[PDB]
Amino acid sequence: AMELVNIFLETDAGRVKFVIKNTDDVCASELINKFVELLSEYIHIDQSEFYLVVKDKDIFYFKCDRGSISIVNNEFYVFDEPLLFVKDFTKITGVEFIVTETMPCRIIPKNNHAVISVVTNHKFYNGLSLHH
């Protein structure tokens, strides 16, 4: 079981996750193409530039630059912001990207979908915490 933690669907019923099951014998590197295929329903992969953050126990970062996929070093964003999700829907209205200072995006949607951009800056502990 793996899911994206930085890209979601906006639907009539609420936020829907990108989830792939039956992955026990594969690492994130081995199925990142399948997540890109899922996203191609909703955006023009050949024109878009974005990041994919996959959770499978650990977190794994990838970049998809006009269809060319690469590994990104671990950036330590929590991708925690307690999100509400729904499991079923009838209409897609948009695609939601969680963007960061180091992970911008350039998205060309299909089918007149909205592009939603939400920022996160929260990172795991790195040896120093600051009272704000």
Swiss-Prot record:
Induction: Expressed in the intermediate phase of the viral replicative cycle. Signal peptide: none annotated. It is found in: Virion. It comes from the Viruses. Keywords: Late protein, Virion. The keyword Transferase does not apply. One of its GO terms (cellular component) is virion component. Its main location: virion. Belongs to the orthopoxvirus OPG073 family. This is Core protein OPG073. The lineage of its organism: Viruses, Varidnaviria, Bamfordvirae, Nucleocytoviricota, Pokkesviricetes. The gene is OPG073.
